């Protein structure tokens, strides 16, 4: 049928320090902006306005903005791949 517009992206973080995103919201958490030099810009698929559902083992639905920033820092700080599931609608 018609797409649910849910995409899962796995980023190899071997060549990047950062995702290079800013997040907005807490009716969820959204990509506010994408920064040049990060893994997300290089991959090209995640856009501003995409809604974050899950990153690695953590669900981002009805999360506080503060909690989202803090747990993304720890997910990025830890070497290894990062899997993001986003809603594009
Ligand atoms: O790696 C990220 O882009 C990132 C994004 C967030 F929303 C939260 C944490 C992240 N990881 S991080 O190393 O702490 C960090 C904090 C701030 C910023 C970045 C990374 C990269 C873009 C400029 C602002």
Domain boundaries defined on the chain:
1-89
- The bridge status of strand 51-55 relative to strand 21-25 is unpaired
Closest CA to 52 of 30, 77, 26: 30
Residues with CB under 6 A from ligand 1: 18-23, 35, 38, 69, 72-73, 76
Experimental resolution (Å): 1.4
Q: Are 84 and 8 in contact (CB under 8 A)?
A: yes
Considering only CA atoms, which residue is closest to atom 16 of ligand 1?
73
DSSP 8-state assignment for residue 36: T
DSSP 8-state assignment for residue 1: -
Closest CA to 84 of 44, 57, 65: 57
């Amino acid at each position: 049928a018609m797409s649910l517009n849910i995409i899962t992206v796995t980023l190899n973080m071997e060549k990047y320090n950062f995702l290079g995103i800013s997040i907005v919201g807490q009716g969820g958490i959204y990509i506010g902006s994408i920064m040049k030099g990060g893994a997300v810009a290089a991959d090209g698929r995640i856009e501003p306005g995409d809604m974050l559902l899950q990153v690695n083992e953590i669900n981002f639905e009805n999360m506080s903005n503060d909690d989202a920033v803090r747990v993304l820092r720890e997910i990025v700080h830890k070497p290894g791949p990062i899997t993001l599931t986003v809603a594009k609608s």
